[PDB]
Write an enzyme that holds these catalytic residues in place. Structure first.
Site, short mmCIF file in Angstrom:
data_model
loop_
_atom_site.label_atom_id
_atom_site.label_comp_id
_atom_site.label_asym_id
_atom_site.label_seq_id
_atom_site.Cartn_x
_atom_site.Cartn_y
_atom_site.Cartn_z
N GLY A 44 -92.38 66.82 48.85
CA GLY A 44 -93.10 67.70 49.75
C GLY A 44 -93.67 66.91 50.93
N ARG A 45 -93.92 67.60 52.06
CA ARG A 45 -94.48 67.02 53.28
C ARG A 45 -95.97 67.37 53.33
N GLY A 46 -96.79 66.41 53.80
CA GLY A 46 -98.22 66.56 54.06
C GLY A 46 -98.54 66.22 55.52
N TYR A 48 -100.20 63.77 57.00
CA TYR A 48 -100.04 62.38 57.40
C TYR A 48 -99.06 61.64 56.49
CZ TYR A 48 -104.65 63.71 59.15
OH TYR A 48 -105.68 64.38 59.75
N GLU A 50 -95.23 62.09 53.74
CA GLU A 50 -94.10 62.76 53.11
C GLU A 50 -93.80 62.03 51.81
OE1 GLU A 50 -91.17 60.29 56.07
OE2 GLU A 50 -90.71 62.49 55.84
N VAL A 51 -93.63 62.80 50.72
CA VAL A 51 -93.61 62.27 49.36
C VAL A 51 -92.22 62.49 48.77
CG1 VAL A 51 -94.64 62.53 47.04
CG2 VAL A 51 -96.07 62.74 49.07
N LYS A 66 -94.96 57.66 48.81
CA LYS A 66 -95.64 58.41 49.84
C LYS A 66 -95.51 57.58 51.12
CE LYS A 66 -100.44 59.92 50.88
NZ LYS A 66 -101.83 59.51 50.56
N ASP A 147 -111.66 65.65 50.60
CA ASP A 147 -110.50 66.50 50.78
C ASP A 147 -110.11 67.09 49.42
OD1 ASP A 147 -108.63 67.85 52.45
OD2 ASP A 147 -107.14 66.23 52.32
O1 LIG Z 1 -95.88 67.50 46.67
S1 LIG Z 1 -97.03 66.65 46.69
O2 LIG Z 1 -97.34 65.95 47.90
N1 LIG Z 1 -98.32 67.56 46.33
C1 LIG Z 1 -98.15 68.79 45.55
C2 LIG Z 1 -99.23 68.96 44.51
C3 LIG Z 1 -99.60 70.43 44.27
C4 LIG Z 1 -100.80 70.56 43.37
N2 LIG Z 1 -101.47 71.86 43.49
C5 LIG Z 1 -101.29 72.70 42.31
C6 LIG Z 1 -102.60 73.13 41.69
C7 LIG Z 1 -103.46 72.21 41.12
C8 LIG Z 1 -104.63 72.61 40.48
C9 LIG Z 1 -104.96 73.96 40.37
C10 LIG Z 1 -106.19 74.34 39.62
C11 LIG Z 1 -106.22 74.27 38.23
C12 LIG Z 1 -107.34 74.71 37.53
C13 LIG Z 1 -108.44 75.20 38.20
C14 LIG Z 1 -108.43 75.26 39.58
C15 LIG Z 1 -107.31 74.83 40.29
C16 LIG Z 1 -104.07 74.88 40.94
CL1 LIG Z 1 -104.31 76.59 40.73
C17 LIG Z 1 -102.93 74.48 41.61
C18 LIG Z 1 -96.85 65.51 45.35
C19 LIG Z 1 -96.00 65.87 44.34
C20 LIG Z 1 -95.80 65.03 43.26
C21 LIG Z 1 -96.45 63.83 43.17
C22 LIG Z 1 -97.34 63.42 44.19
C23 LIG Z 1 -98.02 62.18 44.17
N3 LIG Z 1 -98.82 61.76 45.14
C24 LIG Z 1 -99.00 62.57 46.20
C25 LIG Z 1 -98.42 63.79 46.33
C26 LIG Z 1 -97.55 64.26 45.32
#
Ligand SMILES: O=S(=O)(NCCCCNCc1ccc(-c2ccccc2)c(Cl)c1)c1cccc2cnccc12
Length: 321
Positions: A44-46, A48, A50-51, A66, A147
């Site tokens: 996925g892209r952020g 600042y 890209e992962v 990253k 953040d």
């Molecule tokens: O793609 S990525 O850049 N990021 C995406 C991650 C998406 C996470 N969000 C889903 C979420 C999480 C928690 C809750 C929650 C749960 C219980 C109560 C309240 C809220 C909910 Cl509903 C939703 C990335 C991917 C993999 C490894 C990385 C390694 N390093 C950096 C980036 C990384």
């Protein structure tokens, strides 16, 4: 001008550490060789960064790379230092390596591999508790995330694991320091940021957490929807009410940007019952609302700390099991 503020907890933890701990500008980064990693697929892209999923070809381990978009060397040093200081802490992403591409000279952080991934009231309480463990830890280590938001929380339900990621905005807390208010995603910005009150602290993270909690228990993402940083505080004021807002502004002698006098108006403090509906009611408890109420305060000093939040009745069942 504005009245100063100090953290209620962990106030002096950095002052008591060696300078090297927090003086990240002086940290010297040894870069490894990206060609020890082969990229497999984009994850996925952020803003600042890209992962990618990648493989360390020296030992065939899956890792996450990253790639940092152009950002000042100070900020790369800061993120590395913070990740190293926090490494091994509860639910903190583990930084494995730091590499630079031999042509482009673009820098990359290499992490331990985790999967990314119908939520039960219990599940929300459980994962919120897991986030609080990471926040208490980082705060205790003198660091604000700045953040906290869903994109920065990795969850693997299969193994019921939670990692707090993307420490690119995080900073060390020093009592008396005036920070940049232009941080965090709009929907998660604390009132302190929106009114330009610079002497903020760990408590910022607790507001962001409250925003997350509201969005999940009420099934309203974002909870405070705004069209401009100004309208963002208007949306907050329509819920928390304007009396308490103006009390906060008075207490800290904050000056409110012109673009705020004719836009905030006068609003009652709305009771949390107004957000409850048949298709979120299973997530909403007296306990949940009491807890939420005690995070989402204008006055950063009156919000629960992470450690206080963990002692709230909302988490009694989680703590037990
Ligand atoms: O793609 S990525 O850049 N990021 C995406 C991650 C998406 C996470 N969000 C889903 C979420 C999480 C928690 C809750 C929650 C749960 C219980 C109560 C309240 C809220 C909910 Cl509903 C939703 C990335 C991917 C993999 C490894 C990385 C390694 N390093 C950096 C980036 C990384």
């Amino acid at each position: 001008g504005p009245v100063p503020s100090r953290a209620r907890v962990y106030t002096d933890v950095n002052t008591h550490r060696p300078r090297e701990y927090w003086d990240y500008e002086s940290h010297v980064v040894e870069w490894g060789n990206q060609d020890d990693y082969q990229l497999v697929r984009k994850l996925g892209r952020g803003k600042y960064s890209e992962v990618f999923e990648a493989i360390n070809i020296t030992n065939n381990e899956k890792v996450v790379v990253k790639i940092l978009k152009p950002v000042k060397k100070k900020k790369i040093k800061r993120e590395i230092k913070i990740l190293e200081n926090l490494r091994g802490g509860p639910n903190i992403i583990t930084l494995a390596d730091i590499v630079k591409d031999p042509v482009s000279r673009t820098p990359a952080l290499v992490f331990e591999h985790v999967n990314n991934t119908t939520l039960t009231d219990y599940d929300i309480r459980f994962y919120m508790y897991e986030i609080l463990k990471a926040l208490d830890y980082c705060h205790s280590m003198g660091i604000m995330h700045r953040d906290v938001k869903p994109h920065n929380v990795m969850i693997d339900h299969e193994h019921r694991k939670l990692r707090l990621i993307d420490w690119g905005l995080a900073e060390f807390y020093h009592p008396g320091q005036e920070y940049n208010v232009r941080v965090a995603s709009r929907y998660f910005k604390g009132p302190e940021l929106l009114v330009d009150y610079q002497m903020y602290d760990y408590s910022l993270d607790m507001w962001s957490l409250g925003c997350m909690l509201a969005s999940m228990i009420f099934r309203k993402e974002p909870f405070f929807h705004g069209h401009d940083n100004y309208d963002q505080l208007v949306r907050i004021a329509k819920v928390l009410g304007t009396e308490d807002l103006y009390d906060y502004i008075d207490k800290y002698n904050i000056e409110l940007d012109p673009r705020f006098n004719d836009i905030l108006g006068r609003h009652s403090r709305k009771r949390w019952e107004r957000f409850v509906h048949s298709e979120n009611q299973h997530l909403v408890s007296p306990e949940a609302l009491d807890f939420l109420d005690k995070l989402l305060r204008y006055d950063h000093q009156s919000r629960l700390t992470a450690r206080e939040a963990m002692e709230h009745p909302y988490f009694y069942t989680v703590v037990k099991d």
